[PDB]
Curated annotation (Swiss-Prot):
This is cAMP-dependent protein kinase catalytic subunit alpha. Its main location: cytoplasm. It catalyses: L-seryl-[protein] + ATP = O-phospho-L-seryl-[protein] + ADP + H(+); L-threonyl-[protein] + ATP = O-phospho-L-threonyl-[protein] + ADP + H(+). The lineage of its organism: Eukaryota, Metazoa, Chordata, Craniata, Vertebrata. Belongs to the protein kinase superfamily. AGC Ser/Thr protein kinase family. cAMP subfamily. Allosterically activated by various compounds, including ATP. Activated by cAMP; the nucleotide acts as a dynamic and allosteric activator by coupling the two lobes of apo PKA, enhancing the enzyme dynamics synchronously and priming it for catalysis.
Length: 338
């Protein structure tokens, strides 16, 4: 009801920040390296301590030359620019960003509770009320992002962090893009790709709603709806339409998932005339108090063990490697606006 009013105000704040950024706001010298939290093909995330506050942060470190070689220039520029402009309770806040000769740096809020993926594998599956609690937060997050014409494109439990109150913090805006109408990039996780991405025909924000369906299925089942050894075999399952649900799934849940995992774009929930309200007013979400979820007033079904600021037991261990800053500036023009 009053959501329309809240979203107009959010759009005006976003457009103000999109137009006039604040940027280049710290340096590596101000941070003490503690532990590598995770690695990838073109960078890593480290736990860092701000030297003159003692505040802990998660610092994303990206190698410029590896970003260039793997064709991730625009994606990386989009990520920093989008994170600077957005403000929502379930999005990890960007605190500082900067660059040196070799690396790009994105300093973010540290979430000690770890990935939802890790909790999901340990427990096996989430109960339907547990899954619904998380699903509600993603629904609201996508409603916020889509109204700003932002597409997320990277939904999965690995990118969902559980804070000290048991609420979701969405990380990794590497595939996020502002797009009116259509876009074309073949990016994402094979299990989470919508059929229209695979078919290479151009797509819009509706791919996020497909991805929600995959997420809800995986939270409730413990495994994704489309799975095989080969990624090429996964694509074939996705496009064929057909989904098998576990027998323990409620018939309200099966019904929500058929309207989200819908190949026909003119029939997929979130994309229709009522839009997001088709999801919000669906029977499986009947006990959800949308306002209380937004305000974080609903008591969480799971609170991670807290072991002090700067504890990393919720994360895996990795070979600690130097942050090498070259004496020569690399890829100057490519990242000039970073």
């Amino acid at each position: 009801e009053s959501v329309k009013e809240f979203l107009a105000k959010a759009k005006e704040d976003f457009l103000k920040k999109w137009e006039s950024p604040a940027q280049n706001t710290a340096h590596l010298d101000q941070f003490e390296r503690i532990k590598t939290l995770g690695t990838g093909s073109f960078g890593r995330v480290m736990l860092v301590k701000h030297k003159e506050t003692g505040n802990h942060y998660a610092m994303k470190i990206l190698d410029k030359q590896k970003v260039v070689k793997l064709k991730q220039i625009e994606h990386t520029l989009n990520e920093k620019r989008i994170l600077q402009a957005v403000n929502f309770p379930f999005l990890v806040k960007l605190e500082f960003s900067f660059k040196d000769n070799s690396n790009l740096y994105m300093v973010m809020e540290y979430v000690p509770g770890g990935e939802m993926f890790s909790h999901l594998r340990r427990i096996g599956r989430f109960s339907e009320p547990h899954a619904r609690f998380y699903a509600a937060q993603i629904v609201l997050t996508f409603e916020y992002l889509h109204s700003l014409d932002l597409i997320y494109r990277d939904l999965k439990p690995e990118n969902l962090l559980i804070d000290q109150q048991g609420y979701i913090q969405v990380t990794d805006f590497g595939f996020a893009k502002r797009v009116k109408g259509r876009t074309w990039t073949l990016c994402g996780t094979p299990e989470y790709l919508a059929p229209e991405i695979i078919l290479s025909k151009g797509y819009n924000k509706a791919v996020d709603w497909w991805a929600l369906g995959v997420l809800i299925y995986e939270m409730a089942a413990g495994y994704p709806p489309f799975f095989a050894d080969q990624p090429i075999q996964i694509y074939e399952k996705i496009v064929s339409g057909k989904v098998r649900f576990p027998s323990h799934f409620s018939s309200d849940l099966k019904d929500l998932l058929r309207n989200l995992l819908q190949v026909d774009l003119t029939k997929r929930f979130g994309n229709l005339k009522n839009g997001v309200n088709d999801i919000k007013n669906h029977k499986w979400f009947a006990t959800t108090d949308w306002i209380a979820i937004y305000q974080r007033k609903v008591e969480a079904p799971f609170i991670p063990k807290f072991k002090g600021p700067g504890d990393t037991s919720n994360f895996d261990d990795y070979e600690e490697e130097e942050i090498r800053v070259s004496i020569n500036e690399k890829c100057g023009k490519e990242f000039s606006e970073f």
